[PDB]
Symmetry: C4
Subunit: 331 residues, 4 copies
């Protein structure tokens, strides 16, 4: 595998069609899904030359911990859909690569088992039905050693995924929500979470500038600027198109991550140059999982690591901070 | 049917080619027809998160009455072309959905029969040959219980529809202008109508900002920002491209509606976010009529209702007014 | 024929390939040729409604004479290439339509014969080898009753037409330059012409704003904002893209015409709305000539006349002057 | 051959696939490779008319010497890959055309043999492993009569060329680095070179404005605004998109060249109009070499010479300086 696109074809071959579609699809006409890629493709970097590259490092510090790359594995529900080892395969590869892994509320292996793998697990929260259970999930995650709560804020309910509707797709009987035996979140829900954990709370799915500033005011330790991979509002702006304005508005008040369509180290560089602290990567991690299990994800993460270092140095950046100071031009 | 596009294919199968073309076509090279869709596709919404969605409502008040959605059925002449029950099937489904139905001057069932169906009928006016007959049609409509006069102002004569010319298309002998046994409108014609009814007069086919302001000055209760579905001037700007500027110029002085290419609840949301009070929908209603009669239109209107509610809540809007305060970004 | 595009197909059928290519082609990679159409397609008109259309007229006064449309037939060399009656067929149809016809320096029928047809002939000048012969051609034209000298200023030499090179195209022995038994023009050449005729001198092939202003200063009675149909500099900006800026810069000091890709009455309207006094039309006139001789050109000119009137009234313009006051929007 | 594109097809026929790919390819997804052409295609020139063209000259003075065209042959490593005579064939044709030829550090014929051909050789430098050897290469070049040192500054290491990886491409045993029996460059390396030669030092691969100004401050005699033909950072902005801003920032302090996708005399004109002193041309020279050896390159250079003169005069420019004062418009 010499690009992330080799892995997509290999995943399409092995997965059942309806599962491939569950993974690949977006909501509505898939406008936002396609726009995530379009938007990245319009961005060109203006590289710097003749800088010292004797110690190029891709490491960052985030939410109290060193990460090997400015990247984390995005939350993706039900990973046993893609491979029998599911979340454990992905979490092991992430641990070994030094990349944070986001454990899902709807994980197909329990959060405690996943966290036992080690590494830098984060925990993604879907707000439940009741405040007390939501907060129980948060406490479980914190007790298990998760280092951040990734509160998903863009899913008051799920988007209408027409591929799944047409396929009549439903979870196989062999995949379950292993954390169990839901409701719209509000700012009051954010406060309830913030009051009940000492972990950084990261709001995932912020697109409006006013919401980014309120997230800081609310005591968030980060946000993820995201349209949920084009799976929520069809017609929502891509995160990458809001990122620059949002980074300027928070003015260092929280970490600002982005996701949506990141498919190479050059894409990571683009996101960094627009001001992102780090990115999330979703679908490609699942392609590598589907294609080759743990070793598949490990290979993906090594290819991304090499592509990020490559891109940084070709752009004259010895550190991620320097990459953030690069300028861009739209094509 | 899980999108409006399923219905188009079903209509293409059942209708005779030349009738499908009458419906689908525009004037000239169809530039304005295509641009209506292009323009909507360029618009992205910036959704808001974490707002109270406990009582999301799609209702609006317009021209004195509650409507269930910010939408009305556009005037489309000769609906017996598409189904034997014609306008009565459409008007019944609209009534049952709580959406206003626009009765045409060139309806293939008489305006009085259509209005007898009940619901919230509006009446569209083509200016006749003489002031007295025009005003008779208006009086008939008002006497029959129509709640607004939709004066079409963009048809001093008809556009050159090359599909129809090539097809040598002509009304079958079995469809007639059931309101009977025409001339360019002017501002003087608007005043004659305004002076002779107590109903709100809505000017349909306004694109210039100066014309929107004059419509307010003239005592219009609304306008429809529209290029007549690309069927009049070929090269006329899409309404959606003028809407924001026109909403700012009238500064609350009349309702501002838009039409042209609205094909989903996400499109409704876009129009709302650009400042529209409500939209009209034309061709898709006729596709549903052609495909499945009354029940077909009912299904379409239920799908739109669900898509509008979906979109609103995913964008953090509990009401249409809140949707109007959303910001947009062009792609 | 219900569009100008029907005529192109009919011309492609009858003409020998290499002659069709001579007609259709441009210089280089044909970038400027294609851009003429692209540019027109980006322009949308903002129509006005509810104006008096009781006496819509397409007439204009130009260079001392009434014309039936804001349009003239562009100079196109060697029209016997396309039909045996060549320039006489075209000039007769133009006369009968009330449109000025531009007689070429390289006409395949003598300028005196063409002018004998009557109508409103103009004469296009290519600068010769010597000042005295150039001026003889001008005197011949004036003596024959031509009403304007269209001095071509964008051909210091001919563009590299790769279709013709590949075809090894050469004038058949049966077509000759009937005005005979060339050199780069300069501003000094313009003055020599201006000093030797009382006719309005029109500089054809102006694209820079500074050249438009100098043309006024030089005593030109008009200019044609033009990239020579994409046949001269490959990469020259389309005239339509310079027109607005040039109209503002001359501020009524001379007539400002445009050409390049005008293929409908809607295109005429666009050019007018951008500020053109009139347009030239080239290739479509030759398609109609090739397809059906005199009667073919007559049909084209009647179709354009109807399309121009149609477009004007749909846009609320009772006169060409009103069309010039329309606003536009780029798509 | 009547365009540069005829030569590409002829090269594709004769070269082995993997060598054609080595030549044609870029890094990553080839975004920057494609963008070099896109960017040129967006540029339109605004030509001037009616200027004196009695003595049109394409000559320029650069780095102390007259060149016949505002163009040089770009450095391209290992030219014996494309033809058995390699660099000598290219250098002979360049000499005979009066165009500077850039001898590569990785030339497949020794720099001394190439320079013995005569003409205006320049020498391109890749920074070595040690300062003393780098400087030896520079001294060799100067001793051999090279007239400028083209220091490549955009290759701290090589880009990831996926075509070559997929092809498993490797230098045949019959091609060697004939100058021998590498390390990231820095500004300190530039100074070491500048201190050790009296030749103008030209930094090739500058894209940021701040780097252009520092190059002047560093005592460079020129720069080449370049993304290395899309072979280094995938996502690097095209040089042509930075050129105008960089020319304004150096304000005459050094020569500013550009490369990337120059494929015609019209493209040369575009680069000149954006402010370039001269261009480099890479891939097309290798196509002509592959197709027809020395005589192939000679034919290419004659075709470019004629296309540059053609374009200049059609645009009203009697000299390259006048071409630099042309304005442009983006399409
Ligand atoms: C199959 C699938 C399941 C997902 N499940 C979740 C989830 O449970 N929670 C969440 O916050 N995001 C979820 N996401 C969204 C991802 O976290 C991420 O925002 C999106 O996939 C990012 O884009 P990418 O896949 O283009 O890299 C899911 C995405 C996919 C494709
Ligand atoms: C077949 C057909 C007939 C129409 N008849 C009328 C009419 O009688 N009066 C009118 O004002 N608009 C008429 N319209 C225009 C519609 O009211 C509406 O402006 C246009 O169709 C809106 O766009 P949409 O079809 O893209 O939703 C007609 C449209 C179509 C397609
Ligand atoms: C076959 C052909 C021959 C032409 N000959 C001349 C000429 O002799 N003089 C001139 O000024 N323009 C000449 N032109 C350019 C036209 O006058 C006009 O600028 C160009 O064709 C306008 O565009 P259109 O063909 O797109 O309508 C010629 C154009 C064509 C296609
Ligand atoms: C096969 C190949 C080899 C190259 N080798 C070198 C090199 O040794 N040094 C260098 O500075 N640039 C090198 N370049 C880049 C060229 O100098 C030039 O920047 C690029 O090819 C310019 O674009 P063009 O090929 O689009 O005209 C090479 C380019 C190609 C295609
Ligand atoms: O995009 C998302 O967040 C959802 O698709 C995750 C999910 C999948 C399946 C069932 C429930 C939830
Ligand atoms: O308005 C801005 O500043 C960004 O939306 C521009 C942008 C477009 C596409 C991708 C990234 C950024
Ligand atoms: O777009 C419109 O408004 C017309 O097509 C309506 C109409 C149809 C048929 C006959 C007359 C009128
Ligand atoms: O000028 C403006 O402000 C709008 O025309 C922009 C727009 C384009 C496309 C769609 C909607 C809006
Ligand atoms: O575009 C033009 O103006 C030329 O093609 C006219 C011409 C044709 C043939 C020979 C000479 C001149
Ligand atoms: O800069 C301007 O104002 C015109 O070039 C814009 C334009 C583009 C395309 C067509 C016409 C006009
Ligand atoms: O683009 C470049 O500069 C390299 O491809 C040149 C090179 C080719 C082969 C081996 C080493 C270096
Ligand atoms: O910003 C500018 O001024 C140039 O990037 C514009 C440009 C685009 C494409 C080609 C050349 C120039």
């Amino acid at each position: 595998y010499v690009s992330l696109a080799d892995l997509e074809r290999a995943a399409r071959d092995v997965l059942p069609g309806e599962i491939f579609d569950f993974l690949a699809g977006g909501s509505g006409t898939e406008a936002s899904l396609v726009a995530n890629r379009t938007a990245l493709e319009r961005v060109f970097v203006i590289p710097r030359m003749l800088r010292d590259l004797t110690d190029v490092t891709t490491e960052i510090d985030i939410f109290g911990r060193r990460a090997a790359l400015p990247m984390a594995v995005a939350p993706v529900a039900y990973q046993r859909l893609f491979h029998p080892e599911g979340e454990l395969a992905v979490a092991r590869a992430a641990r070994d690569a030094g990349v944070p892994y986001t454990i899902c509320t709807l994980s197909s292996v329990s959060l405690e088992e996943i966290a036992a793998v080690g590494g830098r697990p984060w925990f993604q929260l879907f707000w439940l039905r009741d405040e007390k259970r939501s907060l129980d999930l948060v406490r479980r995650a914190e007790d298990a050693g998760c280092e951040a709560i990734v509160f998903t804020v863009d899913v008051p309910w799920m988007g209408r995924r027409l591929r799944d509707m047409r396929n009549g797709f439903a979870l196989p009987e062999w995949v379950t929500a292993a954390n169990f035996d839901f409701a719209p979140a509000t700012w009051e829900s954010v406060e309830a979470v913030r009051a009940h954990t000492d972990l950084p709370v990261v709001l995932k799915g912020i697109l409006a500038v006013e919401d980014a500033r309120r997230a800081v005011d609310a005591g968030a330790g980060g946000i993820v600027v995201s349209n949920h991979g084009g799976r929520q509002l069809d017609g929502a702006v891509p995160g990458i198109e809001m990122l620059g304005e949002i980074v300027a508005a928070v003015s260092g008040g929280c970490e600002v991550l982005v996701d949506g369509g990141i498919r190479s180290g050059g894409d990571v560089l683009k996101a960094t140059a627009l001001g992102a602290s780090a990115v999330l990567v979703g679908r490609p991690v699942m392609w590598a999982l589907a294609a080759a299990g743990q070793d598949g994800v490990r290979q993906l993460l090594e290819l991304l690591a090499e592509e990020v270092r490559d891109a940084m140095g070709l752009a004259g950046c010895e550190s991620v901070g320097a990459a953030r100071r690069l300028n861009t031009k739209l094509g």
